[PDB]
Design a protein around this nucleic acid. Structure first.
Ligand SMILES: [Zn+2]
Ligand SMILES: [Zn+2]
Ligand SMILES: [Zn+2]
Ligand SMILES: [Zn+2]
Ligand SMILES: [Zn+2]
Ligand SMILES: [Zn+2]
Ligand SMILES: [Zn+2]
Ligand SMILES: [Zn+2]
Length: 721
DNA sequence: CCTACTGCTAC
DNA sequence: CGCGGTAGCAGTAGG
């Protein structure tokens, strides 16, 4: 008997047949994975192998209504292809279309989450299913394919971050090599795939049947009731703890604690921002790229996203990066207090919360002139730029002149941990910064939204109410001129439209409604004298959904040391930022002076070089460079490397005399020599002025420069709305 | 009273 | 030119 319902299904020839227990079903992650699976069929035969693609992250069958599960075509597709049912407890795979189930995921963190979801799905749906030894299978592929180029040619395959990281630190320096990041399951070429299958028993591992504490760890990972537990489960995790590679048998208990947990950690990392710059890895990459390129002139989002992705080693779909770019630009009421990128297009409106934005290919963006005032360029050389893909990418964090996290706030959903942080008035933030500066007591801050005209009151510490505005403009006629921030027009629109035409369960309570929105909100509502009184008893704000709460009881973020932390007060966040920022201001000056001193040396020896040649004391014309090099050292000339660091001792380590002989012949002309002297003089002056400033003098300098730019920003923003 | 939903980066 | 599904957490409003 054959299946019909599912076309993409490459059903094994002997599936469901007397050899069902022998057949294996390969569940792929995506069609990129599927392509590989069907390509492997040409090697292992269709008789005992079949494959079916999983569309997306799988449904979590825990805490799901039988209706939701039944509605999920994906889950139903598997039950039908495997010939699976609930009743009783599985004893043998004899009653099934297939006798084995193999999981083919990218082998990335999200791929691990897919596996866990499948496992969770099998363990939950089908009692005794995972009891059967050798039922669940896992196909694995390499994470990093290293290629040794110059020294002794051999390719290495690492199946996890740690293995490759222990090599990268303890072996890599000994070779000239290149690392390719093997994501997809859809890119791998066939020349090295036909080998994957010729010897698959090593690319094949088997999940050990359920043992003690296996079911408990699954529940710990996928039980919608154990959020708090995971938090600790992540705290307990010890770096370096990782599954043995090539072992060929996996206990489920330590597949979760050694592989899946890796995803959870990465999940939080990307979903929850850092306290210092209020950025998530994605956002931080975008700005880094925008810094790398000169984004003073606009380019379309569909082009920026791939660009940023390429130069920051972004390992995830570009689509996810493009949306991030959109989110960073969006300038409607209820979105960023300060948008670091300009919405040069239909970047979405307040109506649907930016969801009505145009495709990335229609819109354009660029750096807000104020962005570089916030993230000062002089700080760039200070940060620690993450090493990834044998190549430097974005920093661990940026250090804004003011807590940006407080300016814009943040929201995210990871594993075990969650976050919310509302926006705050930058003017208040700078005020408290001046207070921290002046050894003064901080003033308490309340949530603030750019261009918003509603009112906010504090109920309890960490709790606020947010009111819109409803006014009676006529007998039986009300007018809504403002909604609670983050309350989109379409939400109230549908609600009003509901009361106007009534509903199956609720009787109509609205006589008429209109929309007259301009650069503001304007709902003109008409009520019968009967409803007017009824609304007075319920409250006009309460019955029109013009009241929304704001909770500061879940302000979570990574601290300066990369450790996830929950903040109990707004000032605590600002305080932790301040001291880290102050430290980097002194650190900024110390770096600038060092750099400036080097430049001065560079300029001075360049002048001496030209000067001597003009006297005719030194001659470069002819004379083997070997002989010229000796002359220079013997005259006291120091070598310079690409960074700009001098060497007086006698390669990047030592430097070269390229800063002299590398100059254009132009530099010998008097007009160039004069320009050179002016430059040297300007650098000496820069060094003198710098040494006359304290870390706070410099910080205060940036702050006032920001205040001036911020004022213009507020104008341009109010102008464009 | 439990449910369902919203938000957001990723699949 | 566009639509849809899923994870994960905290809290709020709906049936
Ligand atoms: Zn994938
Ligand atoms: Zn992937
Ligand atoms: Zn191999
Ligand atoms: Zn065993
Ligand atoms: Zn990631
Ligand atoms: Zn990487
Ligand atoms: Zn610290
Ligand atoms: Zn969609």
């Amino acid at each position: 008997s054959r299946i019909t319902n599912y076309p993409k299904l490459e059903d094994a020839n002997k599936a469901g047949t007397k050899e069902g227990y022998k057949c294996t079903l390969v569940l792929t992650e995506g069609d990129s994975a599927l392509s590989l699976a069907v390509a492997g069929l040409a090697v292992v035969g269709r008789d005992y192998y079949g494959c079916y693609p999983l569309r997306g992250k799988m449904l979590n069958v825990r805490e799901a209504s039988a209706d939701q599960i039944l509605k999920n075509a994906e889950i139903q597709a598997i039950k039908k292809i495997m010939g699976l049912q609930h009743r009783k407890k599985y004893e043998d795979t004899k009653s099934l279309r297939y006798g084995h189930l193999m999981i083919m995921t990218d082998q990335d963190h999200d791929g691990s989450h897919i596996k866990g979801l499948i496992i969770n799905f099998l363990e939950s749906s089908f009692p005794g299913l995972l009891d059967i030894q050798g039922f669940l299978l896992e196909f694995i592929t390499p994470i990093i394919k290293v290629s040794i180029t110059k020294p002794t040619k051999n390719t290495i395959a690492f199946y996890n971050m740690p293995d490759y990281e222990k090599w990268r630190e303890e072996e890599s320096h000994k070779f000239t090599w290149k690392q390719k990041y093997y994501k997809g399951l859809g890119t791998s070429l066939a020349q090295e795939v036909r080998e994957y299958f010729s010897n698959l028993d090593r690319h094949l591992k088997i999940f050990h049947s359920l043992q003690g504490n296996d079911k408990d760890y699954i529940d710990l990972a996928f039980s919608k009731k154990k959020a708090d537990d995971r938090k600790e489960w992540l705290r307990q995790y010890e770096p370096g703890t990782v599954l043995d590679p090539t072992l060929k048998e996996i206990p489920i208990s330590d597949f979760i604690n050694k592989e899946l947990i890796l995803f959870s950690l990465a999940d939080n990392i990307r979903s929850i921002p850092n306290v210092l710059d209020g950025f998530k890895p994605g956002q931080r990459k975008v700005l880094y790229g925008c810094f790398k390129k000169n984004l003073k002139s606009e380019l379309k989002v569909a082009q920026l996203a791939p660009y940023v992705s390429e130069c920051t080693a972004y390992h995830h779909g570009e689509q996810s990066l493009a949306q991030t770019i959109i989110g960073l630009a969006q300038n409607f009421v209820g979105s960023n207090n300060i948008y670091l990128l300009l919405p040069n297009g239909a970047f979405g409106t307040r109506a649907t919360g930016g969801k009505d934005a145009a495709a990335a290919r229609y819109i354009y963006t660029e750096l807000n002139k104020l962005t570089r005032k916030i993230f000062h360029p002089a700080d760039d050389p200070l940060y620690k730029y993450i090493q990834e893909d044998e190549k430097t990418v974005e920093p661990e964090w940026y250090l804004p002149i003011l807590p940006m996290i407080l300016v814009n706030g943040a929201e995210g959903i990871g594993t075990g941990w969650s976050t919310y942080i509302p926006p705050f008035n930058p003017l208040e933030i700078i005020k408290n910064i001046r207070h921290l500066m002046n050894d003064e007591e901080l003033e308490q801050m309340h949530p603030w939204f750019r261009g918003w005209t509603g009112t906010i009151e504090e109920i309890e510490p960490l709790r606020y109410r947010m009111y819109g505005r409803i006014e009676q403009i006529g007998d039986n006629v009300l007018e809504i001129t403002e909604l609670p921030a983050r309350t989109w027009t379409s939400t109230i629109k549908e609600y009003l439209l509901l009361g106007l035409s009534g509903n199956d369960k609720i009787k109509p309570w609205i006589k008429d409604m209109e929309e007259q929105h301009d650069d503001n909100i304007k709902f003109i509502i008409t009520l019968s004298p009967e409803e007017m009184a009824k609304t007075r008893k319920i409250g006009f704000y309460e019955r029109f959904k013009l009241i929304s709460p704001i909770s500061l009881m879940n302000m979570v973020a990574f601290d300066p040391h990369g450790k996830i932390k929950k903040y109990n007060s707004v000032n605590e966040i600002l305080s932790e930022f301040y001291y880290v920022r102050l430290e980097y201001y002194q650190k900024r000056k110390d770096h600038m002076s060092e750099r400036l001193q080097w430049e001065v040396e560079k300029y001075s020896f360049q002048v001496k070089f030209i000067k001597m040649i003009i006297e005719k004391e030194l001659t470069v014309t002819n004379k083997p460079r070997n002989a010229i090099i000796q002359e220079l050292e013997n005259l006291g000339f120091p070598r310079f490397n690409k960074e700009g660091k001098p060497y007086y001792g006698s390669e990047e380590l030592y430097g070269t005399y390229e800063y002299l002989l590398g100059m254009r012949i132009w530099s010998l002309t008097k007009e160039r020599y004069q320009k050179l002297l002016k430059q040297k003089q300007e650098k000496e002056t820069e060094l003198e002025n710098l040494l006359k400033l304290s870390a706070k003098d410099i910080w205060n300098t940036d702050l006032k420069a920001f205040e001036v730019g911020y004022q213009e920003f507020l104008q341009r923003d109010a102008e464009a709305r």
